[PDB]
Design a protein around this ligand. Structure first.
Ligand SMILES: [Cl-]
Ligand SMILES: [Cl-]
Ligand SMILES: [Kr]
Length: 162
């Protein structure tokens, strides 16, 4: 397993504009298009992202391209973030994937505020980190996904994904 398969599981894949768990316009593998309630606006951002008149539908290859860009951007965001990088650099490969998933989902800003969890993680206090991570709106809103990611972080294995 790896980061890509990991997020492809958690995000699914949809070729038509759809609304996410928060009701925002999204497409592909979790590619948020806009927080605006306007489909038009969303269709406009879609066309801008793709480079063509999509009419709100993309192909699989197009969805995967956006996905590669987003995973890439997530990693770079982590490395460019002074609160995140040191955490990231201290982790093994599996746990790094867990932190990338959270950033992909919540944004760098969002993740950098799990201050307390980040410190336990950096200290390698897995179980404690795990309990602290569950005390969050993130977990109450998307509990099944949150649990898979938290288990990953805690154990450093891919068991939650098998
Ligand atoms: Cl884009
Ligand atoms: Cl979920
Ligand atoms: Kr974290």
């Amino acid at each position: 397993m790896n980061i890509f398969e990991m997020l492809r599981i958690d995000e699914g894949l949809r070729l038509k504009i759809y609304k996410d768990t928060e009701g925002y316009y999204t497409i592909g593998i979790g590619h948020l298009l806009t927080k605006s309630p306007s489909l038009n606006a969303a269709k406009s951002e879609l066309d801008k992202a793709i480079g063509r008149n999509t009419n709100g539908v993309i192909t699989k290859d197009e969805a995967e391209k956006l996905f590669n860009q987003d995973v890439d951007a997530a990693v770079r965001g982590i490395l460019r973030n002074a609160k995140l990088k040191p955490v990231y650099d201290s982790l093994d490969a599996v746990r790094r994937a867990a932190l990338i998933n959270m950033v992909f989902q919540m944004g760098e800003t969002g993740v950098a505020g799990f201050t307390n969890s980040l410190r336990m993680a950096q200290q390698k206090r897995w179980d404690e980190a795990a309990v602290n991570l569950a005390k969050s709106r993130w977990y109450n809103q998307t509990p099944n996904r949150a649990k898979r990611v938290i288990t990953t972080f805690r154990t450093g294995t891919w068991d939650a994904y098998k």
